[PDB]
Ligand binder design. Structure first.
Ligand SMILES: C[C@H]1c2c[nH]c3cccc(c23)S[C@H]1C(=O)O
Ligand SMILES: C[C@H]1c2c[nH]c3cccc(c23)S[C@H]1C(=O)O
Lengths: 321, 321
């Protein structure tokens, strides 16, 4: 069984685009892959953070992953800073990186040193669990290249302990676009809040965002990205939240106009968020949330500890006991 | 009671200069100060190392400190990599350092990133124990300036948890010079091995190095650094290993020439090393050595854990449990 590792930034609420594109897919793929979901709070502080904003966002993310169906027994959901092997292995990989290498990553009061030195910590986050696949996008290519190059450098200079990972998302979800700019991907941090639908938006606000999404005044419910990216995007969201095949959507709405379809979809979005947010409140406001995160941390520590120990033996850190 | 922290590089055997200058003094000052002696193996790998050479040197250093009289109950002798708070607090301080700052430290395959990014780890090594004093020399000034500046930056941006340290050696020992270059300090890494006397030199080899030390052919046993740095240096070693006051040395050897004095001193050096190396073998070849280092690690972990936790709460890492 292949091991998957996904880093999660506690820096914002995922949108419904992120749910359809990734989270919903993770809820399936956790049965067929050994999955790690790591809330990378030590990466979040490479940037300036309010300390209450950061600690709250970390709980929020954990509650959202659990609300989506990420299962603490099937997968390992934990907080990066609670597992010390991450900064231990990150320091070891830092000593074999080069300054030139780290600088080129930054390209693809002063400048915080975290922004230069975080890539080896990302490498560590991955290889500590013998990861085979990382579900990232084009923007993370140079990071994985550095990771694989460091695994090569380590195994070559000391001895084979580390595994090279690949970029692979096992079941890619649909691509969800901004509601009022259908050529751009939906983003949690848009200045036009009508562009996205946050997982924590009020369900009635989200229904309004479906109605205000930029489309023709009317048309047929047909999937055509090149010529009608607006309605096509909406059909993608419909498909994403109901699992109805797209061709099966077209047939349900044959002879229907936009008003009927946007009305049904806004209701579908509202219904989804009401069910999602009840689960989310229930995890977020519960004592069991700390129990779950405790157990996740213990799972990850058991695996990552063995790896750190092999690494320390390979470089000659510590003692032979 | 003031807390003292001394980093120890596992990169070479201390010389008798290092014993007279520092180690012997630490054996006294550990009664009057809360002392931490930390074998910084995570700093040693910033440079290229053979992994067996490094792990052996680490045991050797611990055995030498114990052989000198460093007392595992009075002081805390441990190995840096066995206490995870060091790289945890080092990462936190890294995120508030600036690249410019770290670069200027480097001034005062490529260039290993460890050589750029180690100073915040040094800062962490110190402040984790609420250190008041660090017994370092001129070459470490910019490192302590960075440390104090990071303590200021941390306490100012989040809230007061960290203590500013000072450079202070509570009882400075004598200065011991190279035996065949009396104007340079004695160094463990000289290309002229007659220049130093290693604590692990064969006692008969060391006696020969006393005889081969570069002096006038004869003279009076008088302390005069400007005009007779050779014999004066030797008198310093004599004073350092026997605790005889220097004026009291001059009076013992009034009416004596160099041959008598160098003969007595070579015997004194031989006698000291025989007693030292028996203790050293006895710790180095013992199962109790791992027990001692275990207990040291547990002592340091208890203090440094509380500090790391205050730091994580201050930046908003982790969870409030
Ligand atoms: C969250 C970040 C991160 C830190 N460690 C990891 C490990 C795997 C994937 C990612 C990460 S994804 C990456 C990003 O920049 O999105
Ligand atoms: C061993 C080095 C080191 C790492 N952490 C610390 C903490 C205090 C003093 C020192 C150190 S002394 C320094 C040196 O360069 O000698």
């Amino acid at each position: 069984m292949e091991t998957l590792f996904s880093g999660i930034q506690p820096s914002g609420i995922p949108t419904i685009g992120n749910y359809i594109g990734a989270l919903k897919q993770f809820v399936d793929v956790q049965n067929d892959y050994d999955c790690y979901f790591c809330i990378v709070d030590q990466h979040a502080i490479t940037m300036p953070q309010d300390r209450l904003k950061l600690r709250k966002q970390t709980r929020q993310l954990a509650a959202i992953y659990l609300a989506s169906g990420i299962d603490p027994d099937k997968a390992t959901l934990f907080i990066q800073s609670e597992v010390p092997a991450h900064v231990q292995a990150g320091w070891m990989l830092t000593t074999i990186a080069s300054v030139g290498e780290l600088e080129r990553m930054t390209q693809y009061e002063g400048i915080p040193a975290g922004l230069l030195t975080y890539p080896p910590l990302m490498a560590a986050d991955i290889v500590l669990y013998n990861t085979n696949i990382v579900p990232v996008g084009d923007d993370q290519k140079q990071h994985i290249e550095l990771t694989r190059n460091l695994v090569d450098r380590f195994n070559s200079r000391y001895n084979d302990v580390l595994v090279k990972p690949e970029i692979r998302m096992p079941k890619v979800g649909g691509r969800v676009m901004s509601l009022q700019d259908p050529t751009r991907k939906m983003s949690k941090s848009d200045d036009n809040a009508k562009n996205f639908i946050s997982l924590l938006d009020e369900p009635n606000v989200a229904a309004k965002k479906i109605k205000s999404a930029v489309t023709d005044s009317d048309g047929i419910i047909k999937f055509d990205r090149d010529n009608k990216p607006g309605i096509t995007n909406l059909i993608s969201i419909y498909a994403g939240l109901t699992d109805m095949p797209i061709k099966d959507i077209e047939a349900k709405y044959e002879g229907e106009g936009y008003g009927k379809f946007k009305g049904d979809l806004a209701e579908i979005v509202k219904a989804f968020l009401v069910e999602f947010q009840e689960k989310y409140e229930s995890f977020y406001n519960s004592d069991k949330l700390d129990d779950i995160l405790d157990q996740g941390r213990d799972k990850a520590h058991k695996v990552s500890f063995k790896t750190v120990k092999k690494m320390e033996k390979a470089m000659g850190l510590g003692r032979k006991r």
